[PDB]
Amino acid sequence: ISLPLQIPTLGKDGALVQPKMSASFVPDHKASMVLFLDRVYGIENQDFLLHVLDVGFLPDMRAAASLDTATFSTTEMALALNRYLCLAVLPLITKCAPLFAGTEHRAIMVDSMLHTVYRLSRGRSLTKAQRDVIEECLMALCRYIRPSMLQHLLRRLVFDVPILNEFAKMPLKLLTNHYERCWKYYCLPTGWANFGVTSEEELHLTRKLFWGIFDSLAHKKYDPELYRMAMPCLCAIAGALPPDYVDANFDPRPVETLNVIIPEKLDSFINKFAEYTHEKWAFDKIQNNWSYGENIDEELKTHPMLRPYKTFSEKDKEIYRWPIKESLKAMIAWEWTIEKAREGEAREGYNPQPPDLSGVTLSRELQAMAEQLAENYHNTWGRKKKQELEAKGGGTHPLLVPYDTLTAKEKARDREKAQELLKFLQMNGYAVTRGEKRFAFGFLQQLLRWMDISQEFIAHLQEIKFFAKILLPLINQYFTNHCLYFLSTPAKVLGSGGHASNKEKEMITSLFCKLAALVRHRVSLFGTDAPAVVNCLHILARSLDARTVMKSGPEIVKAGLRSFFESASEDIEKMVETYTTVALLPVLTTLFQHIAQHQFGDDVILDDVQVSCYRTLCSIYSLGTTRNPYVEKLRPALGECLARLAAAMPVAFLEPQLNEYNACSVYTTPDIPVLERLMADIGGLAESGARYTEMPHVIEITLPMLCSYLPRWWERGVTSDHLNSLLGNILRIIVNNLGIDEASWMKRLAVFAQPIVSRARPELLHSHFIPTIGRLRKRAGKVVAEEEQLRLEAKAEAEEGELLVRDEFSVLCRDLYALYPLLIRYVDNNRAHWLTEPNPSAEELFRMVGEIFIYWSKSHNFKREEQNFVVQNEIN
Amino acid sequence: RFFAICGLQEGFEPFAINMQRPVTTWFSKSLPQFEAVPLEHPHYEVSR
């Protein structure tokens, strides 16, 4: 496999020289050896694979990549090499991809592979299948390499991708698979386990790639395939970047120095630094055992310049002065100031002892200046090298790339040269002088700009397509990922680290208000884009830090929020007298739930906001005795919204008598009955009631409102007696409707009463739970007895009876699923006491539960009905 | 204090039950001492 091949070449005088295919070595001979090696021996060791790649395949891949040129593209040997690579080598390498984990000791080789195959992906004379094979091989290879080993490929991709040609279909996917896998490597301060943390250059490259792709896609015409390919890449890149990160076609343009005059007063400095530079060069050589002698000999360690700087002629001293002046000229062209301000603070023969510059400290400013000089050394050398290669018809050079694409180690030589100069200037008493920015900040301000552009465009009724197809999913993903960073506070940190500034919170609040204002009364105008927009609102509503902005902020955002609340109240009032049912209610419910859960009620709902909330309360409760199918369909959403609002309200509106003691009431800065009347009505309606019909308003609206109201005000008191009475009444109401067929509402009600059960008193065990469980057990026993009696016949008529019980079990499978989740939370609070002191009631209820369990275990129809109910109801 | 609450009915037993004397305890002592080099030390090798 390691034998060489005769590639075509050009004689530079006539036509190209081409080998005779019928009388020489051919890759088709190597293909059989590759097949035999694959099928018989196989590859099992990382070291063997590395050796084979070292000697076997890499030279042939390089030869094909070199032959990709236009003059050699269609020659016979190029086609033979393409077939050989695409049929034997690349599939074998692809099959052995997982062996590439932990190859940190051979990094130099690995990069040399990753470039070459990539170049093979961009060949001109290749069929579609070969291109597919090469792309698949590259994609498989990139899945197992360590993230820190892909820097150079990323550097190449940053240049190649943002043009968005027809060749960019494959690279995008690659990036999409990369950042989705290694997001911890770039995001978390501790990084990924066993992989370390990213460096500054990688983050800079990622930011450049993101902004380049965004700007390029902004102006392009519509193309469904391009958008479908590009959107996930943008989402992944945005999600892989920290929100608070701050950033610190090679045409080198070094600063023009030819006409720059150095003041004569710097001549002594130039001479001192030239002697220093010589002494440092001489010291390093003499300590490495080099000595003076007529010739420059690497073997004998001899150099004729290993003598005192004083022994050099003025023209010879230019070996040192010419580089220094060039540095000084660059500093002067940039209008930097260089002013003297302080006093200029053993081998055979020549022994230079230059001062140690390791103790000379550079400020942040001088280090930034050293970096600027270093970049200029890179650009000076780069322009000279590019001109030399262009004139002398030369190839390329790995350093002919922008300075900002190099690593700290690749920059070291130029950095150290610049640092040595500024340290010596400082040591010699010279004073030398040059004479926001977060990613989320720019992202948010660009989003706001596009929002106002879209508002203007909608008022006018390409940019609409870009908006609806890019901005909404990007906002969705980004804020779903980074809500915690925005919700954090300096006094209370929620996420891994960092917290948004006040300006970012103001911007996000303004964006939410602007989107809510834009979407009003135009849901149909967005067509199929209508649902997605609503989703975005939810994700925005779940990320508002209302307390901070309301405590201190510009009047504009506060006015916007107050106007939003007033408009919502006005829309509700107009409705109770098409759009509110689809968009307003879910967003309002989510906002109220967020406010109540994060405990912002005492700081946000104040002044006219309280008036708007009062209007909403009255309008919602005004439904009352009105009966209509529309109200029947609309009730649950209104009930949920009222429950959330009652959770979030800061004033005890049900007890006006003590209103003088509330410090957050508007009166210290009208048709809903009092709490006692509500409790009395519930108590009197629980007994001699037992019909969901003729009492839907109480069940669907009032009960969730009370169940949300009571726990909030118990903490700052009302008493536990009210909670116990409410739980007992709820249990009685639930048990009173066991025989009903259509009782879906129960599935909701048991959810709302769950937080109450934490405050139950022990007596409720004896009075309420036991009779209900006994009734359930009696019903189950009767049903199972009927089923056994029916199945005893085992005749052909059993098909008539089977469905009859198949219904009944289902009904039972409903009722227990309403009671059992309420009961299980009870015992978890009380069980310990029952173990400390024996109680007969616990034993009896255990007997009932065991009877139910054995009944469930005996029959298979029970299990089938339970599984069907669980699947259909989508319960958890 | 919490054995009866969780563990008694599951069939778990106290570690030192039915023992005449308290269980002996050993602890880590941080006083350097000279010891022979192990025959399979990862880093160092001694040859005669």
From Swiss-Prot, chain A:
Spans of repeat Sequence: 249-345, 346-443
Residues of the full protein shown: 2471 to 3466 of 5035
Signal peptide segment: none
The protein, known as: Ryanodine receptor 1
Coiled-coil segments: none
Modified how: Channel activity is modulated by phosphorylation.
Protein family (similarity comment): Belongs to the ryanodine receptor (TC 1.A.3.1) family. RYR1 subfamily.
Gene: RYR1
Biological role stated in the UniProt entry: Cytosolic calcium-activated calcium channel that mediates the release of Ca(2+) from the sarcoplasmic reticulum into the cytosol and thereby plays a key role in triggering muscle contraction following depolarization of T-tubules. Repeated very high-level exercise increases the open probability of the channel and leads to Ca(2+) leaking into the cytoplasm. Can also mediate the release of Ca(2+) from intracellular stores in neurons, and may thereby promote prolonged Ca(2+) signaling in the brain. Required for normal embryonic development of muscle fibers and skeletal muscle.
Domain comment as written in the entry: The calcium release channel activity resides in the C-terminal region while the remaining part of the protein constitutes the 'foot' structure spanning the junctional gap between the sarcoplasmic reticulum (SR) and the T-tubule. Pore opening is mediated via the cytoplasmic calcium-binding domains that mediate a small rotation of the channel-forming transmembrane regions that then leads to channel opening.
Self-association state and partner proteins as the record states: Homotetramer. Can also form heterotetramers with RYR2. Identified in a complex composed of RYR1, PDE4D, PKA, FKBP1A and protein phosphatase 1 (PP1). Repeated very high-level exercise decreases interaction with PDE4D and protein phosphatase 1 (PP1). Interacts with CALM; CALM with bound calcium inhibits the RYR1 channel activity. Interacts with S100A1. Interacts with FKBP1A; this stabilizes the closed conformation of the channel. Interacts with CACNA1S; interaction with CACNA1S is important for activation of the RYR1 channel. Interacts with CACNB1.
Compartment list: Sarcoplasmic reticulum membrane
